[PDB]
Design a protein around this ligand. Structure first.
Ligand SMILES: Cc1nc(NC(=O)N2CCC[C@H]2C(N)=O)sc1-c1ccnc(C(C)(C)C(F)(F)F)c1
Lengths: 992, 286
């Protein structure tokens, strides 16, 4: 409020002015210039129109503050200093660029000053995708902009599930239209009648012809183009000519039995609600990359030599000479995780002088390098004194692409920084790490020298590979091999594939065009360290029939780094994958974006194009990559993608920045809640947070911003009375926000959010995602094991958001409620007390089915000890698990032992819970759920294998995924897996 | 190294041999075949757990090449036809002859068994109480040392964040000095033709006042060089702290991983010896 800010006037004379905390630039600049005129040397001073403030932010970059409307606290200045200087630049570009930098947390001029040419070529080529996306965005403006800003929430299924088709009155849905048509905002009910096959045009026609009752051709047509359907209380809009059974609100209402809540909002009101978005070309796009190096050359297929790489020295290995004697730089030519040749090692030099100068030769010849070759430098040292036995341990690792964006072999002496060892890395190298030097300078750096040809050598275009494909072939089945191929196709991605079967696969490739499933196994059956084999496989992939997206995503994790294979997979994705299941699998594609060896390829183009044409997909894309700015291994690439998205996402930027700054400010709260407050029973136990949210500068930053967990949900006025903290896991935040719109009372009058710090909410998101795909499978195969994947979103380093479902209580909650107002019959009695009557047994049925949802789930995913606090039951009889965290093995069995209270509740409170009639029905639907998962377990292996390079401390390589492979029993047959589960569900009660 | 010398009985016992390991999963066989050379092989019970499939994981080219042998009419072999009778004479024949008979691409014949009892040579004290006390003290040392290594990694992450934010603050000070020096050069360019005229008309009070508040600019740059110095000495000693903390985790990591290896091999020894968790789980469950 009294900050003494000094300003650098461009005449030279020095002024210092008091400034308020909430004061903006225009409020302080007027008296700044006034008392500057009062102070001497008022000669070069003139009006404020041609004078612009310049300062350096706390992210260490000077940036002009053209936007005069911004406050002092929004400046984020390391020192209270300003400068007054001529603009010498663009207005809108600089406000846009600062807003982009605030959305990332680091500015665009950091991208400007980095001299890696691949980064700037990426920044040039992303604007092609941006301009195509904004051209298709406004191709049918404002109609197409309506579907962009508020996306349809449709699935890819034109039909409907069979077991919910019988949940309605012969395919008919009773809705209520809450249309107002009133200057005095009077709300009213239109209970109204539709089938499911028709699109919303017949629905709005019926609403027109039924609205016109009690006061009675072209009128229906003109109201059709002026009315639109909106979900009450939440911002979903029914826009596109779709059969209306795919809208997730309607299907969720079918799930829960609640009637849908809709209305007829004016189309022009929605059009005026969404602002017109602007897309301007960047300043760096003025530069054209047309280089003429006055100094086309020969290719790889004319130069015949071996791969020779010379190691010069390390800058400084960060070791201790007292207990460590000798060090070495054992390398490896990798293709993802597969060594293309032997791991050629250096000499065992002492750590005192880390100098090698060793010309390591490799078994691979130069023409036989694959496109995605990855050298893996590793400083690892023998730190064990044993006789004829050396103990090895990694210290530094670093991957290097042998080909760049120019698609040429690396050459010449070059230094490169090395990443520190990951936590608990089993391998001595790092197969899964990304290629690139460490951005930090205080890490060990090492020198390389490739075979300097005194020229450039270029990997050829596909014409040469196409000709070599016809060349190498010159150099009607027995059905047993066909059924063998069918057997190979059904195997999981982690199948024990053999070279008998690999040689069978490679020797019969043109006969594998009949079945498309065999492709990823044929990925593993080829020798990438070959000349003819890679050409043959490229020729096959160029003519290979398209793939279902669920196993077209198989070609995307770390084991498949080939640009052509990943390009074909991305082509199959954009040809087949739909928006709802793209947003379903969006976390996995975000984590696949790490595995790209380059910056600009087809995957990033596809994900950007789908992100810049969809507010939901783009919003979740932005939040997923924003959650990983703390990961410096892919911070540059993901920061470039936040830069591109924030360039071409439109006015959501503002809303985005608001929630971002809200989250950032909220994150700051937890800092004072964690570092300053780490004790108990003080004067400021609860009063401090009440006073802090009573501060206008904090509470005003949490007003009117969209929910980060769902763009359709919007968050409004905060209730400080209904905000508190817990003492359950690590003191998270209970946050209550009233839904701003008037019709909020239909769905929920208040939105509750858990804000969690202290645990990584990234594996929890993955677990809840698994839960949602098992929901999809069980609904598709005809079993309504209704288990809820509550929304969870990580937003950075060990920080997350959880949306709260209400009317829920723990076992501890109901136990202490019963004790105050313990026995093994309290859960069943409480469920009697909540919903008795003719619905009660149905609720019990739900409680059985959701149990059959979770128990099997908690065995397949291997969740930890599910005690009485990390589980909650609803009022309508539905349980769900919350504290997932440690998943798969995570401690190296028997997860989620069926407790007694379950045996009371599923068995209707009978004393003999063992052989009730509903118990074998429970077991039968558990069996059916597991089998339905089991023929779809290939997708689960894919989805967990596309998460290896993420960075959870409990999912790194093929040491953890064997847990779900052994619980799902892909090695065993179906009946062996069945008896496996009769074993575990017989020892669940230790005898029953 | 491998001593071999099983004996004159070539068709010996399947269950106890250098090549045999039984029903083992992919995790520990990947641990066994890691850091090996050409010709390193291992034969286990197959992943299907059927009647005598008995797959092989020969090491060649840095890859655990996963050979499967067949079980046609009670005979064994790499591929059809199965002209060889026993698996022991099969692996001895491939120890004597190359693999070019069935398929051409394989070059290495065989070099090094991974015996089950090579690790059993370094272990002793077969009696239950001695290994029980040894496993208890190994477990408590592993727990204390893993807690120490987790603390070391937390310190490493905290110091990395501290040094990164201090590096950004130092770069911010560098940018501030660049802006101040550019401003100083610019105002010298304007003021080299301004002060002497107002001298020439004969007044110096305005000049001494503007010289006084101009000296405030040099004063401010003087303390912010001081702050950059106190933050750069801070940066240097925090970088030294980061280096020595990395040296401590450098010392703590390798004995941790070999202690984990010995714990895993002791678990394998207890598994093959047949005694499951009876009394060891009682101490850990407290
Ligand atoms: C999905 C969900 N729903 C809730 N709802 C209520 O707690 N309610 C709703 C009714 C009142 C109140 C209660 N009885 O208590 S909490 C929650 C959740 C999910 C995941 N993590 C958490 C943490 C981090 C706070 C926990 F518990 F693990 F530490 C909570």
């Amino acid at each position: 409020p009294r900050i003494l800010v000094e300003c650098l006037l461009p005449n030279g004379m020095i002024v210092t002015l008091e400034c308020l905390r909430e004061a903006t630039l225009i409020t302080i600049k007027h008296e700044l210039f006034k008392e500057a005129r009062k102070y001497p040397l008022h000669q070069l001073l003139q009006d404020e129109s041609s004078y612009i403030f310049v300062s350096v932010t706390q992210e260490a970059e000077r940036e002009e503050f053209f936007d005069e409307t911004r406050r002092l606290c929004d400046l984020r200045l390391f020192q209270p200093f300003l400068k007054v200087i001529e603009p010498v630049g663009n207005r809108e570009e600089k406000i846009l660029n600062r807003e982009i930098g605030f959305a990332i947390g680091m500015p665009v001029c950091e991208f400007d000053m980095v001299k890696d040419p691949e980064v700037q070529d990426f920044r040039r080529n992303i604007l092609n995708v941006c301009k195509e996306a904004v051209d298709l965005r406004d191709l049918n403006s404002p109609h197409s902009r309506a579907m962009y800003v508020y996306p349809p929430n449709v699935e890819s299924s034109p039909e409907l599930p069979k077991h919910i088709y019988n949940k309605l009155d012969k395919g008919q849905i009773i809705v209520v239209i809450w249309v107002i048509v009133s200057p005095n905002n009077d709300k009213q009910k239109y209970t109204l009648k539709i089938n499911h096959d028709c699109v919303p045009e017949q629905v709005i026609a019926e609403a027109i012809r039924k609205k016109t009752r009690s006061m009675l051709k072209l009128c229906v047509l003109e109201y059709q183009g002026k009315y639109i359907l909106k979900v009450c209380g939440c911002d979903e809009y029914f826009l596109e000519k779709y059969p209306l059974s795919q809208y997730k609100y309607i299907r969720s209402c079918i799930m829960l039995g609640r009637m849908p809540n809709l209305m007829l909002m004016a189309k022009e009101s929605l059009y005026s609600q969404l602002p017109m978005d602007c897309f301007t070309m960047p300043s760096y796009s003025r530069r054209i990359s047309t280089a003429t190096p006055y100094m086309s050359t020969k290719s790889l297929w004319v130069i015949n030599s071996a791969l020779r790489i010379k190691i010069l020295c390390a800058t400084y290995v960060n070791v201790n000479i007292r207990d460590i004697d000798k060090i070495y730089v054992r390398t490896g030519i990798y293709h993802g995780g597969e060594p293309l040749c032997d791991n050629v090692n250096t000499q065992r030099v002492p750590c005192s002088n880390p100098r090698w100068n060793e010309w390591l030769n490799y078994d691979i010849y130069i023409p036989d390098l694959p496109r995605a070759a990855r050298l893996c430098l590793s400083i690892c040292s023998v730190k064990g004194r044993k006789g004829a036995k050396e103990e090895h341990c990694p210290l530094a690792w670093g991957n290097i692409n042998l080909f760049d964006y120019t698609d040429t072999l690396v050459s010449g002496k070059m230094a490169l920084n090395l990443w520190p060892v990951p936590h608990g890395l089993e391998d001595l190298l790092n197969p899964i790490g990304v290629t690139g030097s460490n951005p930090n300078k205080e890490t060990p750096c090492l020198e390389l020298e490739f075979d300097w040809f005194s020229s450039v050598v270029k990997f050829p275009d596909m014409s040469v590979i196409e000709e070599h494909a016809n060349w190498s072939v010159s150099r009607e089945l027995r059905e047993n091999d066909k059924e063998q191929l069918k057997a190979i196709s059904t195997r999981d991605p982690l199948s024990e594939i053999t070279e008998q079967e690999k040689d069978f696969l490679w020797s019969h490739r043109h006969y594998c065009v009949t079945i498309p499933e065999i492709l990823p196994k044929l990925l593993l059956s080829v020798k990438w360290n070959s000349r003819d084999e890679v050409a043959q496989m490229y020729c096959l992939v160029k003519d290979w029939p398209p793939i279902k997206p669920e196993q077209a995503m198989e070609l995307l994790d770390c084991n498949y780094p080939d640009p052509m294979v990943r390009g074909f997979a991305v082509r199959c994705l954009e040809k087949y994958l739909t928006d709802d299941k793209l947003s379903q699998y969006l976390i996995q594609l975000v984590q696949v974006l790490k595995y790209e060896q380059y910056l600009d390829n087809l995957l990033v183009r596809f994900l950007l194009k789908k992100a810049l044409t969809n507010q939901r997909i783009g919003h979740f894309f932005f939040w997923h990559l924003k959650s990983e700015m703390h990961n410096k291994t892919v911070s540059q690439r993901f920061g470039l993608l936040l830069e591109s998205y924030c360039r071409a996402c439109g006015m959501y930027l503002k809303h985005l920045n608001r929630q971002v700054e809200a989250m950032e400010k909220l994150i700051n709260l937890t800092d004072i809640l964690k570092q300053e407050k780490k004790d108990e029973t003080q004067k400021v136990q609860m009063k401090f947070l009440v006073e802090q949210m009573r501060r206008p500068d904090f509470m005003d930053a949490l007003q009117g911003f969209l929910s980060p967990l769902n763009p359709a949900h919007q968050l409004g006025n905060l209730r400080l009375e209904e905000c508190r903290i817990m003492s359950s896991a690590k003191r998270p935040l209970w946050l209550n926000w009233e839904n701003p719109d008037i019709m909020s009372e239909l769905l929920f009058q208040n939105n509750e959010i858990i804000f969690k710090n202290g645990d990584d909410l990234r594996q929890d998101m993955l677990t809840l995602q698994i839960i949602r795909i098992m929901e999809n499978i069980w609904q598709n195969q005809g079993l309504d094991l209704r288990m809820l994947p509550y929304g969870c979103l990580s937003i950075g380093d060990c920080v997350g958001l959880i949306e709260v479902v209400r009317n829920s209580h723990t076992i501890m909650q109901i136990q202490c409620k019963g004790g105050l107002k313990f026995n093994s019959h309290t859960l069943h009695q409480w469920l009697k007390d909540k919903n008795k009557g003719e619905i009660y047994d149905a609720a019990i049925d739900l409680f059985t089915r959701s149990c059959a949802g979770y128990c099997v789930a908690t065995f397949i995913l291997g969740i930890g000890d599910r005690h009485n606090s990390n589980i909650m039951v609803k009022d309508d009889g539905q349980l769900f698990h919350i504290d997932f965290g440690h998943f798969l093995d995570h401690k190296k069995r028997v997860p989620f032992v069926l407790t007694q209270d379950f045996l009371i509740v599923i068995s209707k409170g009978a004393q003999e819970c063992t052989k009730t009639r509903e118990f074998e029905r429970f077991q039968e639907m558990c069996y059916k759920a597991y089998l339905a998962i089991r023929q779809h377990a290939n997708l689960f292996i894919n989805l967990f294998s596309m998460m290896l390079g993420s960075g959870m401390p409990e999912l790194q390589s093929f040491d953890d995924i064997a847990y779900i492979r052994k619980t799902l029993a892909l090695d065993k047959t179906e009946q062996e897996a069945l008896e496996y589960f009769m074993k575990q569900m017989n020892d669940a009660h230790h005898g029953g | 190294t491998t001593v071999a010398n099983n004996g004159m009985n070539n068709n010996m016992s399947l269950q106890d041999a250098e090549w045999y390991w039984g029903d083992i999963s992919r995790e520990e066989v990947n641990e066994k075949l890691r850091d090996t050379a050409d010709g390193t092989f291992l034969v286990r019970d197959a992943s299907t757990k059927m009647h005598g499939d008995y797959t092989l994981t020969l090491r060649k080219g840095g890859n655990n090449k996963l050979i499967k042998i067949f079980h046609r009419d009670g005979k064994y072999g790499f591929s059809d036809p199965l002209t060889f009778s026993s698996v022991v004479e099969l692996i001895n024949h491939y120890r004597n002859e190359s693999l070019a008979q069935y398929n051409p691409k394989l070059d290495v014949k065989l070099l090094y068994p991974v015996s089950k009892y090579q690790q059993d040579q370094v272990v002793k004290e077969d009696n239950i109480e001695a290994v029980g006390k040894k496993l208890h003290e190994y477990n408590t040392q592993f727990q204390e040392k893993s807690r120490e290594y987790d603390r070391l990694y937390e310190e490493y992450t905290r110091t990395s964040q501290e040094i990164q934010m201090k590096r950004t603050a130092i770069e911010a000070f560098n940018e501030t000095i660049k802006i101040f020096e550019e401003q100083c050069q610019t105002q010298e360019r304007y003021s080299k033709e301004y002060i002497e005229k107002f001298k020439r008309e004969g007044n110096e009070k305005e000049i001494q006042r503007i010289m006084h508040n101009y000296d405030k600019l040099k004063s401010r740059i003087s303390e912010i060089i001081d702050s950059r110095r106190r933050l750069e000495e801070d940066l240097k000693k925090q970088a030294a702290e980061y280096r020595e903390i990395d040296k401590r985790m450098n010392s703590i990591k390798p004995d941790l991983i070999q202690l984990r290896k010995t714990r895993d091999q002791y678990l394998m020894w207890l598994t093959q010896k047949g005694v499951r968790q009876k009394k060891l789980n009682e101490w850990l469950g407290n």
